[PDB]
Design a binder for this molecule. Structure first.
Ligand SMILES: [Ca+2]
Ligand SMILES: [Ca+2]
Ligand SMILES: [Ca+2]
Ligand SMILES: [Ca+2]
Ligand SMILES: [Zn+2]
Ligand SMILES: [Zn+2]
Lengths: 6, 168
């Protein structure tokens, strides 16, 4: 979970 | 194959700045600078996207190192696990790239984690790429060291879909 959103 | 974020977010310009808010003690500042430059360069070589370092003010890609709760609501997890994370393109926190300083950062070595390869990956996300199923892709979700790195066709085609091929 290394690509996050905002 | 290659993937994006669901809303296909991308940068609206080709000239992008970065800033390094803090360094890792694990590596010489010099070494870190050039690691990040090279990481950005691997995406520059196949797109018209151009990355420029600044030493002050708000950059598009604010880079820092940090561990556990480091102030963005997505904590790190100690040694191993998450190596780093990056936000999809956007304003503010968008694009920003953080690195877990509980890890040992290295260059050109099977011990620790190559800052070059992990930055290059994390920045991929900062550009709008999601993970690839391809084991030999830079955007694979699992770390692998390789002494001689190349971009897999999968990495090139994904990024060229978003921003097009190099003009030069
Ligand atoms: Ca930003
Ligand atoms: Ca912390
Ligand atoms: Ca970690
Ligand atoms: Ca460290
Ligand atoms: Zn990733
Ligand atoms: Zn973070």
């Amino acid at each position: 979970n290394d690509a996050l959103i905002x | 194959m290659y993937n994006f974020f669901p809303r296909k977010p991308k940068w609206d310009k080709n000239q992008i700045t970065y800033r390094i808010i803090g360094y890792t003690p694990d590596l010489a500042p010099e070494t870190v600078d050039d690691a990040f430059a090279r990481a950005f360069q691997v995406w520059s070589d196949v797109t018209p996207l151009r990355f420029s370092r600044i030493y002050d003010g708000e950059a598009d890609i604010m880079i820092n190192f940090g561990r556990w709760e480091h102030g963005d609501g997505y904590p790190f997890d100690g040694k191993d696990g998450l190596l780093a994370h990056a936000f999809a393109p956007g304003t503010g926190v968008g694009g920003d790239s953080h690195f877990d300083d509980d890890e040992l950062w290295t260059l050109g070595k099977g011990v620790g984690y190559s800052l070059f390869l992990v930055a290059a990956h994390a920045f991929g996300h900062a550009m709008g790429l999601e993970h690839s199923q391809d084991p030999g892709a830079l955007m694979a979700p699992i770390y692998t060291y390789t002494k001689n790195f190349r971009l897999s066709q999968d990495d090139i085609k994904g990024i060229q879909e978003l921003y097009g091929a190099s003009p030069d």
